[PDB]
Design a protein around this ligand. Structure first.
Ligand SMILES: *[C@@H]1O[C@H](CO)[C@@H](O)[C@H](O)[C@H]1NC(C)=O
Ligand SMILES: [Ca+2]
Lengths: 55, 465, 165
C-alpha cells in the first residue's frame, strides 16, 4: 500500500487464503509445527505461490 | 558388518592443462581405447599395416609404464589407506593417542602427496601419448584420396556405436545419483542439527569425515556421467545429420579422429561410472552403520528434555500450595462462621457505627474467598493447556515406526527435539502467569488474616457494649 | 525490530545473496523509534465500587505498539468490531468509557481511531470462539495502532542522520 498510494507504483499481493483467516498471526503460538498441523503438506502449496510470483 | 573401505582407485588427478585425465583404473587413459578403435579402423583400411605394428608396441610400452607407476604409488596408497581406516572407525581411534585434528591434517598431506606422486610419474608417458598422436596423423596422411573419399566406415560404425549406446544403462544411474545426492544433503543437514545436542565428538567426527569423502565421490560421479551424456549426445547428434558422402582428406582425418575420441569417452566413462556406483553404495552403508550407533545416545537427550522443559513438577508445586491455601482459609471461615452468625444478630438492635465497619469486613471475607476460588480455577486452567502441550509430544513420540530403514529414525528424533523447542513461548508465558496469580493468593492470605483479627476485635467490642 | 537475532538473520540473508552471485548486493541502515515493553508490567484489573477489595484479571504478555503510556479507570462497553456503522448502532452512548472489540475486519488503528472519535477512554482487544477457533484460551498477541504507515516521528522525510532528527 505505500508502493501504490504514496509513490504511485503498481503493486500486487496474493494469498492462498482460507475462507476464515489464519487464527494466529501476531502470536506466541505461531510456530512451524502448528503451521504444519494447519496445512497438511506445505511444499506443494509454497511451490504454487513461488510459481505465481516467478511467472 | 561394514567398517572399512577396500577400494581406493577412484582417486585421480588430471593435468595442469586439464586436457588428459588419469584414472587409477585400467588402462588409465581413454586414448588407449581410442588406439584400439583406430586399430579396427586400420583393420578396415588395407593400406595402413604400420598402425597395427606400432599399436602392438605402444599398448605394450604404455601399459607397462602405467602399472609400474601404480606400483611406485601403491606404497603411498597403503599409507593413505592406513589413515583412512584410522579415520573411518571410532574403534581404531580409541586405541590411538593423538587427537583428531592433526590426523586430519596428515590425511590432507598424504592425499595431495598421493596425487602428486601419481602425476609426476605419468608425465613421461603423456609425452609418449603426444608422439603416438603425431605418428597417427602422419600414418593417416600416408593414404591416397584427396578428392572424394567415402565415408562408409563413418556411416556404419556410427550404427554400431548406437547399438553400444542403447546397450548401456543411463536412467538408473541418473535416478540413483539424484535420489542419493538428495539423501546426502539431507544427511549433512542432519549433522549440523545433531552436533549441538549429542556430547561425544569422536563418532560425529567420523561421520563428518565420511560425508566429506561422499562429497568427493559424488562430484566425480557427476563428472563422469556428464562426460557420458555429452558423448552420447554428440555421436547421436552427428547421426541426425546432414550426412555428407564426400569429404576432403584432412576432413576425413579430423572426421575419424573426432568420432573415435567420442567413443573413447564413452568406454572410459562406462567403467568409471561402474566403479563409482559401487563405492557410493559402500560408503552409504558405512554411514548407516555409524548413525545406528548414534541414535541410542540420541534418545537419552530426548528423555532429558521432556522432563526438563515443561516446568511440570514446579507447576504441580504451585497448584499444591494454592489448594492448600484455599483449604486453610475455607477451614478458618468454617471455624468462625457461627460467631459471624451471632455477630450479625447483635448489630441491628443498637448503635450501628462500628458494625458498619464489621459489615465491610464480612463482605471482604466472602468476596475474598470467592476470589481465591477463581484464582485456583485460573491456574488449573492454564496448567491444563500446558499438560496438553506435553501430551501431544508424547503421542508424537509413540507414533514412530520402529521399522525405519535406514537412518530415518534419527530424522524422527530430530523432529521431536524440534517440537519440544517449539513449545517454549507458550509454556514460559503460562508459567509466568501462574507465578503472578500465586503472588496474589499470598496477598489475599495476609489480608484474610487481618480480616479474622478484625472480627475478633469486633467480638470483644460487642461483649463490651 | 533491532534485536540481535534480527541482525544475525540479516547477515545470514546477505551472505546468501553473496553466495548466489547476484549482480549487486547492498545493505541500508537507519534509526527509527519503536515502542517496547517496560520493566513494570501492564495489567487489566477489576475495581469494585467499595474500593477496599481489588481483583486482578490478567497480566497480558502482548502489547499494542504506539499506544499512549497511561493508566485509566472506567465503565466498559462492548463495541463489536469498531466499524463506524457498528459504532452508529450502539444502545448505550460510548463517551467517557472503555470499549472492547474483537479483532477482525479492519486494522487495530482504525478501531482505536474510531473509538477515539467517539471520545472513549481505552480499547481492549480479544479473540473469540466463533471467528478464531483454537484450543488454547490463554493465548496473547501483538498489534500496532498507528493510522497510516511509516515511522511516525519522521512523517514525509526519511529517518537518516542527514536530517539530524
Ligand atoms: C459523556 O458521558 C457522561 C457520562 O460519563 C455524561 O455525563 C455527559 O453528559 C456525556 N457528554 C455529553 C456531551 O452529553
Ligand atoms: Ca519517514
Amino acid at each position: 500500500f505505500p508502493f501504490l498510494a504514496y509513490s504511485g507504483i503498481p503493486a500486487v499481493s496474493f494469498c492462498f487464503c482460507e475462507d476464515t483467516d489464519y487464527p494466529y498471526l501476531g502470536t506466541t503460538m505461531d510456530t512451524y509445527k502448528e503451521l504444519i498441523e494447519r496445512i497438511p503438506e506445505l511444499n506443494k502449496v509454497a511451490r504454487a505461490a513461488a510459481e505465481v510470483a516467478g511467472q | 558388518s561394514t567398517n572399512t573401505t577396500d577400494n581406493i582407485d577412484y582417486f585421480d588427478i588430471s593435468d595442469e592443462s586439464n586436457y588428459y585425465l588419469i584414472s587409477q583404473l585400467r588402462p588409465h587413459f581413454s586414448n588407449i581405447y581410442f588406439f584400439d578403435e583406430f586399430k579396427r579402423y586400420a583393420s578396415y583400411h588395407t593400406e595402413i599395416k604400420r598402425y597395427e605394428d606400432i599399436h602392438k608396441t605402444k599398448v605394450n610400452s604404455l601399459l607397462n609404464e602405467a602399472s609400474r607407476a601404480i606400483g611406485i604409488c601403491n606404497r603411498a596408497k597403503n599409507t593413505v589407506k592406513g589413515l583412512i581406516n584410522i579415520l573411518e572407525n571410532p574403534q581404531k581411534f580409541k586405541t590411538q593417542r593423538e587427537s583428531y585434528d592433526v590426523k586430519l591434517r596428515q590425511y590432507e598431506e598424504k592425499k595431495e602427496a598421493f596425487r602428486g606422486c601419481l602425476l609426476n610419474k605419468n608425465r613421461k608417458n603423456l609425452d609418449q601419448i603426444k608422439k603416438i598422436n603425431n605418428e597417427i596423423r602422419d600414418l593417416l596422411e600416408k593414404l591416397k584420396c584427396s578428392q572424394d573419399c567415402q565415408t562408409n566406415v563413418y556411416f556404419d560404425m556410427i550404427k554400431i556405436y548406437l547399438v553400444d549406446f542403447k546397450k548401456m544403462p543411463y536412467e538408473n544411474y541418473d535416478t540413483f545419483i539424484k535420489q542419493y545426492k538428495n539423501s546426502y544433503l539431507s544427511g549433512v543437514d542432519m549433522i549440523r542439527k545433531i552436533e549441538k545436542q549429542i556430547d561425544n565428538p569422536v563418532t560425529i567426527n567420523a561421520i563428518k569425515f565420511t560425508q566429506k569423502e561422499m562429497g568427493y565421490i559424488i562430484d566425480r560421479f557427476e563428472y563422469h556421467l556428464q562426460k557420458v551424456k555429452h558423448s552420447i549426445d554428440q555421436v547421436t547428434a552427428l547421426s541426425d545429420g546432414v550426412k555428407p558422402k564426400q569429404v576432403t582428406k584432412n576432413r576425413l582425418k579430423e572426421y575419424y579422429f573426432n568420432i573415435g575420441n567420442y567413443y573413447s569417452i564413452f568406454k572410459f566413462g562406462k567403467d568409471s561410472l561402474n566403479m563409482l556406483n559401487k563405492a557410493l553404495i559402500h560408503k552409504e552403508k558405512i554411514v548407516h552403520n555409524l548413525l545406528g550407533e548414534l541414535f541410542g545416545h540420541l534418545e537419552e537427550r530426548i528423555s532429558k528434555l521432556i522432563d526438563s522443559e515443561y516446568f511440570i513438577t514446579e507447576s504441580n508445586n504451585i497448584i499444591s500450595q494454592s489448594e492448600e491455601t484455599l483449604k486453610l482459609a475455607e477451614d478458618v471461615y468454617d471455624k468462625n462462621t457461627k460467631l459471624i452468625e451471632d455477630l450479625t444478630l447483635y448489630p441491628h438492635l443498637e448503635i450501628n457505627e462500628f458494625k458498619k465497619d464489621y459489615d465491610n469486613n464480612v463482605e471482604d471475607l466472602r468476596e475474598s474467598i470467592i476470589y481465591i476460588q477463581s484464582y485456583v480455577s485460573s491456574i488449573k486452567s492454564a496448567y491444563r493447556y500446558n499438560v496438553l502441550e506435553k501430551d501431544s509430544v508424547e503421542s508424537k513420540q509413540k507414533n514412530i515406526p520402529a521399522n525405519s530403514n535406514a537412518q530415518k529414525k534419527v530424522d524422527e528424533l530430530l523432529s521431536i527435539i524440534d517440537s519440544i523447542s517449539y513449545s517454549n513461548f507458550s509454556v514460559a508465558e503460562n508459567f509466568q502467569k501462574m507465578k503472578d496469580y500465586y503472588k496474589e493468593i499470598e496477598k489475599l492470605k495476609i489480608k484474610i488474616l487481618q480480616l479474622i483479627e478484625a472480627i475478633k476485635k469486633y467480638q470483644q467490642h460487642v461483649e463490651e457494649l | 525490530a533491532g534485536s540481535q537475532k534480527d541482525e544475525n538473520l540479516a547477515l545470514y540473508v546477505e551472505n546468501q545473496f553473496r553466495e548466489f552471485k547476484l549482480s549487486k548486493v547492498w545493505r541500508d541502515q537507519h534509526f527509527v523509534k519503536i515502542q517496547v515493553k517496560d520493566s513494570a508490567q501492564n495489567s487489566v484489573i477489576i475495581v469494585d465500587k467499595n474500593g477496599r477489595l481489588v481483583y486482578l484479571v490478567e497480566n497480558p504478555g502482548g502489547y499494542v505498539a504506539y499506544s499512549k503510556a497511561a493508566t485509566v479507570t472506567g465503565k466498559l462497553v462492548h463495541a463489536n468490531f469498531g466499524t463506524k456503522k457498528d459504532f452508529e448502532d450502539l444502545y448505550t452512548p460510548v463517551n467517557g468509557s472503555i470499549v472492547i472489540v474483537r479483532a477482525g475486519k479492519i486494522t487495530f488503528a482504525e478501531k482505536v481511531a474510531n473509538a477515539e472519535s467517539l471520545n472513549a477512554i481505552g480499547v481492549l482487544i480479544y479473540m473469540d470462539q466463533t471467528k478464531f477457533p483454537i484450543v488454547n484460551a490463554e493465548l496473547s498477541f501483538f498489534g500496532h495502532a498507528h493510522l497510516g504507515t511509516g515511522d511516525p516521528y519522521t512523517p514525509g522525510f526519511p529517518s537518516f542522520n542527514h536530517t539530524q532528527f
